[PDB]
Amino acid sequence: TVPNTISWSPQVALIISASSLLILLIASRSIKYPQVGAKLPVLGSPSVGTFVASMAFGHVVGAGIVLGLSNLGWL
């Protein structure tokens, strides 16, 4: 059977936003070279490259989580 994919709803927006936000906190405190290049609070004051990388990885991880849950009926 074709794995289930759910229609767009505020819950998938929450999953993607939370994944991007949590990655933003972790990356600015864990990656080897943050604050490299141009600069953009509670964060570690990440650079432009760090922030864009966090958002891109938030989309990558968030998409995997959204399809992963929707496949299994929310795991």
Partner: protein, 739 residues
């Protein structure tokens, strides 16, 4: 000198056979090893614990593999009440055809042993259904044992050897073992019960291939996060539910029905799941009590050393000085081992007492031999654990206790009124023994003279009152749970007594082991059990408290835990060490557990016969025990092989003798002492030296076994004979007489 033992130069220079023997007896006493430091001691203990865990996992893997390979698990599933579970196959190339025919049974085409450990019922209850699942579990346990062996090796490497401070950090260890080792493990087991065991008991297959997308409950996890927890208790299994099928099956995952499942006569799986959920929550909460790294939390040393009760001056908790104890336990591995062994013994006793009355496994209550074997096994293990707890308490007294760091605290006070403690224990033991034995022999004489009515038959009214308070209406008492109008039965403020219907149904059922009816014989045997417990405690406590010294030997602490004697001077000092007290107490532990298991087995044999009156009328005099329990039930056991042929009991028949042999052998080690054998060995040495063609010659000079070694060997033979004889009798009298 020899290289072996590596850990003792004193033994390595010994030119006699003793060097070998002691090398085995002191190998695991790491503290006495040459050049031993505390940090190395802790690291070696940690690695040894890894090894022991690996051994346990390998044992479980072997049990699973042999059941999956040679057992009849799948056939037993289809009819647990009439199929004999198979432990493993028999390969004894010196059997005759009659033995092969006798041991070929339980639907097998080859000789097999009948499993009595109850693992079939346990695996059936937790959702295992196929031999492939058992094989996968065995492979996984092999891998887990390999992982733990690798961890043990790794934590001995220089970079991974933990420091002494890591081993001495009590608070984080307590937090992690309460919240994670106890709480998280219980939560994971509840998860396994909810996700796997209950659906399998309802005829639905859940495994690693489909558990990710098969919700255990229709309401899903949304009911838990919203707070609609009651949805998990809705629609429980009906009273007509058939195990391992959807007929009469409910959908609830966490109920509190109580009592027993009507068909399996065992505890509800949903009840067990909710139990483990609650236990996990409680232990996770408890695992946050102590301060580790964030300021919050109690400090055990501060609590023990505290002397102020909200401003008022107190000597300590309950106005008792507990100061200095934190360092006493923290620096004494024997003290911690004493608590560990005592707790494990109490837990094993509780397991034995609660598993027969409240069977947790489907149909395990109808496997009489399995029930008897499990009860006896766990009770004997509990007795051994208690003996070990007190032995290591004595070892702590000798090795780890120093008076100045414990001046004034409760331990010092106990050491200071040890005389009163021991004398009062002796008084209790004397009273119990005198009156119990006197009443027994009075009843024996009266029954022998045809006057059974003249027996003194004291009713156990207190225990009967407790049973009535628990809901047993047989005795006519109308108190608490046996009174439907009682404040306890109604629970007037809330009426949340959702256990009471099922619990009362189980209590008042006449075909189970939940609060068995008791009479004068139960009273007398319970007082005999109390006598045994008090005498064993007296021996162990007298050994522990006198370990440091007595009037006969004021300087005992300077001679160690285990030494033979202090010579024939001052009247003679045989068996004066605390080790000798533990040696003596093992005999009383064996006697007490023998009484306990005799009582349990005879009562349950009478129940299973349909001849409860035999136990009721015969247990009040000792000739009844001798005749109607031992002599009456030994017939099938001793007829396992005879001049007319053999049957499946032959092994037990042989082992029954084997134990009787080992027991007899122990007497030789316990009655005859060393010097006789030393002189005989000297004569044999002369004989060998003067005989031609005997080119052999000893490299270690043959000597008689030492005094302590002889006591230990005799005790080992005695215990092995005791256990083998009683186990053979138990299995033969229950299995050859029932299913």
């Amino acid at each position: 000198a020899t290289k072996f033992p590596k850990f003792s130069q004193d033994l390595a220079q010994d030119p006699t056979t003793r060097r070998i023997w002691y090398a085995m007896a002191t190998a695991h006493d790491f503290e006495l090893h040459d050049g031993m430091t505390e940090e190395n001691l802790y690291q070696k203990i940690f690695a040894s614990h890894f090894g022991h865990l690996a051994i346990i996992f390998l044992w479980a893997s072997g049990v699973l593999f042999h059941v999956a390979w040679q057992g009849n698990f799948e056939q037993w599933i289809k009819d647990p009440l009439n199929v004999r579970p198979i432990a493993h196959a028999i390969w004894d190339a010196q059997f005759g055809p009659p033995a092969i025919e006798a041991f070929t049974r339980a639907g097998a085409t080859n000789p097999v042993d009948i499993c009595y450990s109850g693992v079939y019922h346990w695996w059936y209850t937790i959702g295992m259904r196929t031999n492939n699942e058992l094989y996968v579990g065995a492979i996984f346990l092999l891998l887990l044992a390999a992982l733990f062996l690798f961890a043990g090796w790794l934590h001995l490497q220089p970079r991974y050897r933990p420091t002494l401070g890591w081993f001495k950090s009590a608070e984080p260890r307590l937090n992690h073992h309460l919240a994670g080792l106890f709480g998280v493990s219980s939560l994971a087991w509840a998860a396994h019960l909810i996700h796997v065991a209950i659906p399998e008991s309802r005829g639905q297959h859940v495994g690693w291939d489909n558990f990710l997308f098969t919700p255990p409950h229709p309401a899903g996890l949304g009911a838990f996060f919203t707070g609609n927890w009651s949805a998990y208790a809705q629609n429980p299994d009906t009273a007509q539910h058939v195990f391992n099928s959807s007929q009469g099956a409910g959908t609830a995952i966490l109920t509190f029905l109580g009592g027993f499942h009507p068909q399996t006569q065992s505890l509800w799986l949903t009840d067990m799941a909710h139990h483990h959920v609650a236990i996990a929550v409680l232990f996770i909460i408890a695992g946050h009590m102590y301060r580790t790294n964030w300021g919050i939390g109690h400090s055990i040393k501060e609590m023990l050393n505290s002397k102020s009760f909200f401003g008022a001056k107190v000597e300590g908790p309950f106005n008792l000085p507990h100061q200095g104890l934190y360092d006493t336990i923290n620096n004494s591995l024997h003290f911690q081992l004493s608590f560990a062994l005592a707790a494990l013994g109490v837990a094993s006793s509780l397991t034995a007492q609660h598993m027969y009355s409240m069977p947790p496994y489907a149909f395990i209550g109808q496997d009489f031999t399995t029930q008897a074997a499990l009860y006896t096994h766990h009770q004997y293990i509990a007795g051994f654990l208690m003996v070990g707890a007190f032995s290591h308490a004595g070892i702590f007294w000798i090795r780890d206790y120093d008076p100045e760091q414990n001046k004034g605290n409760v331990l010092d006070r106990m050491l200071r009124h040890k005389e009163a403690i021991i004398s009062h224990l002796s008084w209790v033991s004397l009273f119990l023994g005198f009156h119990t034995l006197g009443l027994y022999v009075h009843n024996d004489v009266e029954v022998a003279f045809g006057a059974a009515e003249k027996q003194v038959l004291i009713e156990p009214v207190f225990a009967q009152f407790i049973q009535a308070a628990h809901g047993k209406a047989l005795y006519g008492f109308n108190t608490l749970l046996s009174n439907p109008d009682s404040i306890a039965s109604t629970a007037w403020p809330n009426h949340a007594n959702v256990w009471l219907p099922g619990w009362l149904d189980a209590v008042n059922n006449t075909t189970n082991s939940l609060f068995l009816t008791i009479g004068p014989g139960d009273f007398y045997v319970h007082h005999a059990i109390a006598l045994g417990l008090h005498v064993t405690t007296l021996v162990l406590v007298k050994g522990a408290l006198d370990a440091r010294g007595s009037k006969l030997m004021p300087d005992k602490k300077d001679f160690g835990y285990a030494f033979p004697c202090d010579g024939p001077g001052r009247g003679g000092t045989c068996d004066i060490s605390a080790w000798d007290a533990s040696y003596l107490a093992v005999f009383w532990m064996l006697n007490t557990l023998g009484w306990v298991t005799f009582y349990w087995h005879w009562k349950h044999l009478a129940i299973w016969e349909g001849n409860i009156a035999q136990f009721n009328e015969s247990s009040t005099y000792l000739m009844g025990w001798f005749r109607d329990y031992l002599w009456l039930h030994s017939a099938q056991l001793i007829n396992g092989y005879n001049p007319y042929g053999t049957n499946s009991l032959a092994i037990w028949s042989w082992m029954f003798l084997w134990g009787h042999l080992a027991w007899a052998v122990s007497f030789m080690f316990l009655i005859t002492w060393r010097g006789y054998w030393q002189e005989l060995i000297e004569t044999l040495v002369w004989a060998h030296e003067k005989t031609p063609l005997s080119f052999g010659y000893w490299r270690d000079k043959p000597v008689a076994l030492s005094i302590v070694q002889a006591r230990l060997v005799g005790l080992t033979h005695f215990t092995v004979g005791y256990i083998a004889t009683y186990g053979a009798f138990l299995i033969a009298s229950t299995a050859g007489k029932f299913g």
